[PDB]
Curated annotation (Swiss-Prot), chain A:
Gene name of the encoded protein: AME1
Organism: Saccharomyces cerevisiae (strain ATCC 204508 / S288c) (Baker's yeast)
Binding partners and assembly: Component of the heterotetrameric kinetochore subcomplex COMA, which consists of AME1, CTF19, MCM21 and OKP1. The COMA subcomplex is part of a larger constitutive centromere-associated network (CCAN) (also known as central kinetochore CTF19 complex in yeast), which is composed of at least AME1, CHL4, CNN1, CTF3, CTF19, IML3, MCM16, MCM21, MCM22, MHF1, MHF2, MIF2, NKP1, NKP2, OKP1 and WIP1. COMA binds the centromeric nucleosome-binding protein MIF2, and to the outer kinetochore MIND subcomplex, probably via AME1. AME1 interacts directly with OKP1 and an NKP1-NKP2 dimer.
Region forming the signal peptide: none
Keyword Lipid biosynthesis: no
Any one GO CC term of the record: spindle pole body
Subcellular localization, as worded in the UniProt entry: Nucleus; Chromosome, Centromere, Kinetochore
Domain of life, per lineage: Eukaryota
The protein's role, per its UniProt record: Component of the kinetochore, a multiprotein complex that assembles on centromeric DNA and attaches chromosomes to spindle microtubules, mediating chromosome segregation and sister chromatid segregation during meiosis and mitosis. Component of the inner kinetochore COMA complex, which connects centromere-associated proteins and the outer kinetochore. COMA interacts with other inner kinetochore proteins to form the inner kinetochore constitutive centromere-associated network (CCAN), which serves as a structural platform for outer kinetochore assembly.
Major subcellular site: nucleus
Listed name of the protein: Inner kinetochore subunit AME1
Comment field (misc): Present with 1630 molecules/cell in log phase SD medium.
Family as reported in the entry's similarity comment: Belongs to the CENP-U/AME1 family.
Curated annotation (Swiss-Prot), chain B:
Function: Component of the kinetochore, a multiprotein complex that assembles on centromeric DNA and attaches chromosomes to spindle microtubules, mediating chromosome segregation and sister chromatid segregation during meiosis and mitosis. Component of the inner kinetochore COMA complex, which connects centromere-associated proteins and the outer kinetochore. COMA interacts with other inner kinetochore proteins to form the inner kinetochore constitutive centromere-associated network (CCAN), which serves as a structural platform for outer kinetochore assembly.
Family: Belongs to the CENP-Q/OKP1 family.
Domain of life where this protein originates: Eukaryota
Subunit structure: Component of the heterotetrameric kinetochore subcomplex COMA, which consists of AME1, CTF19, MCM21 and OKP1. The COMA subcomplex is part of a larger constitutive centromere-associated network (CCAN) (also known as central kinetochore CTF19 complex in yeast), which is composed of at least AME1, CHL4, CNN1, CTF3, CTF19, IML3, MCM16, MCM21, MCM22, MHF1, MHF2, MIF2, NKP1, NKP2, OKP1 and WIP1. COMA binds the centromeric nucleosome-binding protein MIF2, and to the outer kinetochore MIND subcomplex. OKP1 interacts directly with AME1, with an NKP1-NKP2 dimer, and with CTF19-MCM21.
Protein name: Inner kinetochore subunit OKP1
Swiss-Prot record, chain C:
Family: Belongs to the NKP1 family.
Keyword Cell cycle part of the UniProt annotation: yes
Protein name, per record: Inner kinetochore subunit NKP1
Location of this chain's protein in the cell: Nucleus; Chromosome, Centromere, Kinetochore
Quaternary structure and partners: Component of the inner kinetochore constitutive centromere-associated network (CCAN) (also known as central kinetochore CTF19 complex in yeast), which is composed of at least AME1, CHL4, CNN1, CTF3, CTF19, IML3, MCM16, MCM21, MCM22, MHF1, MHF2, MIF2, NKP1, NKP2, OKP1 and WIP1. NKP1 interacts directly with OKP1 and AME1.
Annotated function: Component of the kinetochore, a multiprotein complex that assembles on centromeric DNA and attaches chromosomes to spindle microtubules, mediating chromosome segregation and sister chromatid segregation during meiosis and mitosis. Component of the inner kinetochore constitutive centromere-associated network (CCAN), which serves as a structural platform for outer kinetochore assembly.
Organism field: Saccharomyces cerevisiae (strain ATCC 204508 / S288c)
Gene (UniProt): NKP1
Length: 84, 114, 57
């Protein structure tokens, strides 16, 4: 109820304002070779931030399922070995 | 986007350290990212910083200062937002649960050969 | 002997992590910015549900 909302609120937070802020700013500064730094250095920042969090928020969204399945998987194999 | 509560109040009707706990989870995520991919992109610094360490410091200060002004903005936007305390900063950390997965998958392995 | 640790290392990092990192690095080296930084926004949308940990377990 609150895990998914926090996951959706934060991914939309960067994607709607912060990621475009780095994207829109970089669209102008390309003549000055040093001004290419700040905004694409900023672009690589939030763009990867959304990259690993979606690999981290989904990680806790799968590890609470995969391990739950694995804990389930641990049950019948324990129900096998005890039965053995 | 911004204005959490207007969305959040419209959300939580169809279903502060805790708020700070969520807040410091952003800090861990936004600072490790501020570092981890910085060296992955650091090999491009020399060719476009014109061999100037001051320009390297200039971007670091600007890439930082542009974050706390939002970090203060996100702090003031998160306090006004409300959440139920069903989240732990330990659980959201990948390493704590990845190690727990390692223990669980290993425990699944010793009994497998048993 | 616990062969599961060795096999898990082979299919977790030796296989999947290598291909992911190589894809990102080599396609980045293929460049300019826009073409590679967009063509991979649609690979997540169509290779999804293929890197979930449970089903590769």
């Amino acid at each position: 109820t609150t895990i998914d909302v926090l996951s959706s609120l934060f991914i939309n937070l960067f994607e709607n304002d912060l990621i475009p802020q780095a994207l829109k700013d970089f669209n102008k500064s390309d003549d000055d070779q040093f001004r290419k730094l700040l905004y694409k250095l900023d672009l690589r920042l939030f763009q990867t931030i959304s990259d690993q969090m979606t690999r981290d928020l989904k990680d806790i969204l799968d590890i609470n399922v995969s391990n739950n399945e694995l804990c389930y998987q641990l049950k019948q194999v324990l129900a096998r070995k005890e039965d053995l | 986007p911004w204005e959490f509560r207007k969305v959040i109040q419209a959300e939580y009707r169809e279903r502060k350290i805790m708020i700070g706990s969520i807040l410091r989870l952003l800090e861990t995520n936004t600072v490790s990212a501020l570092d981890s991919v910085f060296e992955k992109y650091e090999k491009e610094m020399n060719q476009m910083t014109h061999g100037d360490n001051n320009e390297v410091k200039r971007i670091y200060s600007k890439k930082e200062r542009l974050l706390e002004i939002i970090l203060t903005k996100i702090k003031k936007k998160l306090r006004q937002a409300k959440f139920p305390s069903r989240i732990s900063e330990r659980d959201l950390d990948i390493e704590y649960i990845y190690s727990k997965r390692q223990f669980i998958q290993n425990r699944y392995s010793q009994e497998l050969q048993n | 002997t616990d062969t599961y640790n060795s096999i898990s290392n082979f299919i977790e990092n030796e296989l999947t992590a290598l291909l992911s990192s190589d894809d990102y690095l080599m396609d980045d080296l293929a460049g300019p910015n826009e073409v590679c930084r967009l063509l991979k926004a649609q690979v997540i949308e169509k290779r999804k549900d293929a890197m979930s940990r449970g089903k590769q377990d």
